Structure formats: C-alpha cells, structure tokens
C-alpha cells in the first residue's frame, strides 16, 4: 500500500561541500540516498514530495570526522507491505519452488505449498509454468496475490504470497 509519510533523516556531508551551495548538495544526497532505498520501518521510499520546501536544521560538526551531520525532514511517498493484504502484480520468475510476483518495487514469493493442489509444475514447456485445467501461470502473466507474511530488515523487505483462497489467482 502507498502512503504519504513524514520522514526524517540524518545526512552527513564531507567537508569538501562547505560552500554557498551546500544546501543544494544536501538535496542531492537526499535524492540519491533516500529515493529507491528500502527501510524496514517505513518500507520502500519512492518519491520525495515538496522538493523546494525541504527543511534542514543547523548542522553539527563531528569531532573526529570533520563532516557535518544534517537532520533533514521531508515528505515522501512510501510503499509498506502488510500481511493479509491483496495486491496485483506480474510474474517475473518461475521455478520448482514457486513463482514470484512483482508488486511495485517488491517481489512476492508464492511457495509450492501455498498454491492450490490443482496447479502443477511443468518445465518441459519453454518457459516453465504452473498449469491447471482452467488457467496457466507463466512469466509476464498477471496474478492477484495475498501477502501471508513479511520479514522487514533494516535495509530490505521480503514477503510470501498465497493464491489458495478463492478470488485469488490469474486476473
């Protein structure tokens, strides 16, 4: 799910950037260190809103490092997954263990046990697929997945998906 979250960061600036345009460098650091990053506490951070209106407090010089620590408050759109949520995505990889669905910046794993009994794994077909008398699942196919669990690390997030329940599967 996508949220507009008010986040704060502690940036460090090397002494080589102490000039009239120091604020510009801090904005670049925020755009290069925040955007595209994954944080378990808040989830993926996609975009930073109000680029011009970023508030920067006075920097503090570290004793033995010489760099300045800047606390930057900004508004950014984030994607934090949750178990029990229903999301849509496209299958990107397949194997005996299970196929993976691309939900935004996250990859959902559908284990062989979680998928219905009817689905069977066949690798003779190129590419490999999960086939059921009704439908067939393969790369680039759109699948509706239910997140059954999420493990959020400080710098990474992984989740598992299930299509056992009704109204979940090929779209």
């Amino acid at each position: 799910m996508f949220f507009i979250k008010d986040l704060s960061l502690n940036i460090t600036l090397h002494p080589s950037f102490f000039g009239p345009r120091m604020k510009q460098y801090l904005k670049t650091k925020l755009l290069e260190e925040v955007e595209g990053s994954c944080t378990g506490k808040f989830g993926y951070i996609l975009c930073v809103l109000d680029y011009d209106n970023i508030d920067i407090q006075r920097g503090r010089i570290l004793p033995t490092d010489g760099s300045a620590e800047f606390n930057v408050k900004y508004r950014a759109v984030v994607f934090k997954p949750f178990k029990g949520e229903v999301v849509d995505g496209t299958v990107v990889s397949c194997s005996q263990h299970g196929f993976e669905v691309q939900v935004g910046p996250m990859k959902v794993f559908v284990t062989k046990h979680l998928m219905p009994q009817d689905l069977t794994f066949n690798a003779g077909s190129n590419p490999p697929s999960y086939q059921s008398s009704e439908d067939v699942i393969t790369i680039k196919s759109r699948i509706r997945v239910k997140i059954e669990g999420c493990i959020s690390q400080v710098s990474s997030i992984h989740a598992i998906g299930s299509i056992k329940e009704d109204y979940l599967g090929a779209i």
């Binding site: 090397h14 002494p15 080589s16 102490f18 006075r58 010089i61 004793p63 033995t64 010489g66």
Partner: peptide, 28 residues
Amino acid sequence: RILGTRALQISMNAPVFIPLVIRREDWS
C-alpha cells in the same frame, strides 16, 4: 575546538574563504 575543527576540514579538501557557530545559545 574551532581551530582543530577547521584544520581537519581543510585537510579533507574543504574550500577556504570559518563559517562555524559555537553551540555553547548559538554564537558565530
């Protein structure tokens, strides 16, 4: 600490023009 702070900053390839304020109340 300002004298050592700027000395380290200069040694780390910092431009030379001491834009620092002592946070005792902040004073420049």
